[PDB]
């Protein structure tokens, strides 16, 4: 945030809206400045987030952060399979598996 205030930008209108909602949610203490409240939220691990489709903020502050996620060996490329007709079994004459 200090970077933002240094770059010459104040608090956003949408951020103010989210802060109002957050005050209603009991997430921030009423009376404090926008920066203090945003800081409270951030300390709760929450930030203001904008919907990329509308540019309007999500009505509540959202938990955002780095997470370690792995891609598992179960890939759909190895699993998708289809058959019209194909080989049949010797004795049963039923499709192979």
């Amino acid at each position: 945030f200090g970077k933002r205030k240094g770059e010459g930008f104040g608090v956003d209108k949408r951020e103010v809206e989210v802060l109002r909602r957050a005050e209603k949610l009991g997430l921030v203490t009423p009376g404090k400045t926008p920066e203090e409240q945003l800081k409270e939220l951030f300390l709760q691990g929450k930030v203001v987030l904008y919907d990329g489709r509308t540019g309007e903020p999500i009505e509540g502050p959202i938990v955002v952060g780095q997470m370690f996620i792995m891609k598992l060996y179960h890939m759909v490329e190895d699993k998708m399979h289809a058959r019209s007709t194909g080989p049949y079994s010797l004795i049963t004459q039923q499709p192979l598996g």
Binding site: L49, I58, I62, V63, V64, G65, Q66, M67, F68, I69, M70, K71, Y73
Partner: protein, 98 residues
């Protein structure tokens, strides 16, 4: 780190020394004894499950290395640390049923 080390994924310096050669295929190290030890690097090898087994050199020519220092990262290794995935920026929220 212990997981990477004990699984023998990565390559480590046998003793103190200086890195003589660095290649995608091989690392040559000159130890304190004066002997030249050449470590071939396993490259794009196929494991039992078809996943890639390859070692990337993590040292440069002329680098001074001590005993047990990292020479090459194996698969799922980032500077000697177990690297099973990716660090990504996440948001915890519903999103249109997706």
């Amino acid at each position: 780190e212990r997981v990477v080390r004990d699984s023998l994924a990565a390559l480590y310096a046998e003793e103190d020394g200086e890195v003589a050669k660095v290649d995608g295929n091989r690392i040559v190290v000159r130890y304190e004894d004066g002997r030249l030890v050449e470590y071939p690097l396993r490259r794009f090898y196929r494991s039992n499950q078809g996943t890639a087994l390859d070692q990337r050199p993590r040292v440069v020519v002329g680098q001074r290395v001590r005993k047990g220092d990292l020479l090459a990262d194996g698969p799922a290794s980032e500077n000697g640390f177990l690297a099973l995935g990716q660090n990504v920026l996440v948001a915890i929220m519903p999103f249109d049923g997706y």
